Amino acid sequence: LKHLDKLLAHCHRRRYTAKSTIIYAGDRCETLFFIIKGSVTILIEDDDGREMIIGYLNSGDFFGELGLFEKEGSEQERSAWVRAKVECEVAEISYAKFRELSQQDSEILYTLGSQMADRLRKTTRKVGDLAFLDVTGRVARTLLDLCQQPDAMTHPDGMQIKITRQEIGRIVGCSREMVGRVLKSLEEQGLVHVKGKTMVVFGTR
Amino acid sequence: KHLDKLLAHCHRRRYTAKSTIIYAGDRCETLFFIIKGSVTILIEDDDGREMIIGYLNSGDFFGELGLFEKESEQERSAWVRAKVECEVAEISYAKFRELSQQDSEILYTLGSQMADRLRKTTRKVGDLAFLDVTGRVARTLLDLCQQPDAMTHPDGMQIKITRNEIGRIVGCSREMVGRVLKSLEEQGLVHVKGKTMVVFGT
Ligand SMILES: Nc1ncnc2c1ncn2[C@@H]1O[C@@H]2COP(=O)(O)O[C@H]2[C@H]1O
């Protein structure tokens, strides 16, 4: 991504502590972000106003990019909340500067497009998971999927991931008590071992 | 500015209603653009149950989600089925990547369509959270009642739809839809009368 060098030269670096909200859904859109270090959580509210975790983005990912685009070329609003998952260092750049550099080098838009396409694939699969799987299947699939994503650690017996019961519940759309019951069953069946802030998922190497 | 500009390098093909244009799991090698018509986007579970993700219309590209992997080429992420007769422009990824190298305008159009699809599909995720199949079918029936192909009825609204079609909207089997409809009749929401259904209230 050497073609991003000229974009990062015009970025202001900001640090966000874990759990701090970077983007609030519904806000105006004038700024694009690039994750230098750390990771962020993408959240929406369901129709009950209850929060659901859509996914995570990691170093090398842009976020806040969808606000560049609108159907009639009118004002656009932030489509989700973005919250630091761990301590994050982000590069912030105005839409106005991004537009000038992307007009100078379309490779920047190829990188942005590649990331948006990946997110659309993942979110489309999430529709299927919510429709096709019951909660036990959704919890198991979430655990397996997280083992293949950044910040999973190779473990002698599988992969180790940084996640809590509450987070899994917000990902799969069930109660915090229900995820406890499901995870207990999955532990007894040999898929997972739950720890304080981490979980070990067996058979994922 | 590039409509005839891009079509100048495109093959034009026609697809009749219900034809599959893209099969999920195939190699991505071709970008499509709808000159006229509309398509349905569908996914499946590992048992062949189908679910509709959404629709694309005249002016929409599709088959684009493998286009930006210049690196490792992707598989088609969904089925694309012609909803009506479609006139489509087609261009290989190879030729498009060369033509678009200094074309930020065309990449911005592709990005804008992907952004629209990401927002809509994210809202669809939110609308599915905490909704079991019976609630999904009920909401679909109420939604179908507000569409222009519905008919008013003394007791409410009358719709024409098959269990197969309901199952594709909610992502379940035809048999499961049948069981749900029997439950919604016992609830008092609907009366199934062969090929049509009456939805009470609304
Ligand atoms: N389904 C999704 N997957 C990944 N990231 C998303 C998703 N929906 C929204 N976002 C991100 O959240 C951001 C919120 O602000 P924007 O709409 O500007 O840009 C959005 C994307 O960067």
Ligand SMILES: Nc1ncnc2c1ncn2[C@@H]1O[C@@H]2COP(=O)(O)O[C@H]2[C@H]1O
């Ligand atoms: N969530 C979605 N919304 C709209 N269109 C989609 C969605 N998911 C996949 N598609 C389209 O279906 C196509 C299938 O092949 P591709 O993955 O190459 O590109 C895909 C997109 O054009």
